[PDB]
Amino acid sequence: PLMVKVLDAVRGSPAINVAVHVFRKLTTEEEFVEGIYKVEIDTKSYWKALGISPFHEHAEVVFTANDSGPRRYTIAALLSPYSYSTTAVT
Amino acid sequence: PLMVKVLDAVRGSPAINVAVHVFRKLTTEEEFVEGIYKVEIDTKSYWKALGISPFHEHAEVVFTANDSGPRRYTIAALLSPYSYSTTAVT
Amino acid sequence: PLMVKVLDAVRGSPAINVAVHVFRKLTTEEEFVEGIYKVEIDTKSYWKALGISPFHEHAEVVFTANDSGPRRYTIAALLSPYSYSTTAVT
Amino acid sequence: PLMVKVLDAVRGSPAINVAVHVFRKLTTEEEFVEGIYKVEIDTKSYWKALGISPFHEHAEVVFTANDSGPRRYTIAALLSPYSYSTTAVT
């Protein structure tokens, strides 16, 4: 027998993030649990999974990836629960 | 027998995020649970899964990806529950 | 036997997000649960799943992807339940 | 018999992140749990999984990846729950 208890009794005011997983028993993926708490920020991808036999014969490819530019990302308390606090962004 | 308990009794005022998963028993994916709590921000993708035999013969491809420009992303308390707090963005 | 209990008794005023999943037993996907809590912001995609045999013979392709421009994204308490707080955006 | 207890009784106000996993029993992945708490920031990828036999014969490829530009990433309390504190970003 399997018995799992998480946070059975709570009396205060907690900021909680719970993730309980109980199990009993070109690209291939059969059984999985991805990104239960996943935070992708400014994620880039170029030329993924082109396919079977791309550019097979006499290919003249000019690939240029220019990444630049004034960009700002301001974040406070990412994935960070808080109970009695003061969070400010200026 | 399987028995799972999460937050059986609560008496206060908690900011809670619960994710309980109980299991018993070119691109291929059979069984999965993706992005239960997924936060994609400024996610880019170019040329994904072109197909079977793209640009097979005598291909002249000029690929240019220019990423730039004044861009701002201001976020407070991302995936961050809070109970007794002061969250301000200015 | 399977028995799952989440937040059996609540007496206060909690800001709760619950996601309970109970299971018993070119692109192909058979069984899945995607995006239970998914927040895509400024998500881009170019040239996805062109098909079977695109640009097969004597293809002259000029691909230019210009990303720019003054853009702002202000968010407070993304996926962040709160109980007794002050959330302000200015 | 398997019996797991995490945070059985709580009386105060703690900022908690819980991840309980209980198990009993070109690219291939069968069973896995990835990114329970994964935070990708400014993650880049170029030319991933081109496919079977790309650029097979007489390929003339010019690959240039220019990464540059004024970019700023300001984050406070990443994956850092806090109970009685003052978090400020200026």
Place this chain on the structure above:
Amino acid sequence: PLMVKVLDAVRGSPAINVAVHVFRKLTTEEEFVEGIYKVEIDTKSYWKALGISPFHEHAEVVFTANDSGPRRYTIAALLSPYSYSTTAVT
């Protein structure tokens, strides 16, 4: 019999990160738990898993990877829960 107890009784307000794992019993990966708490920052990758027989015959490849540019990454309390503190970024 297996019996695991973590933080059975809590009376104060601790900032806790818990990860309890209980087990009983070109690229191939069968069973794994990756990135329970993984924080990738400014992670780059070029030309990963090109495929079976790329550039097989008479390949003329010019690979140039220029990494540069004014970039700043300011982070406080990464993966660092705190209870009674003052975290400030200026």
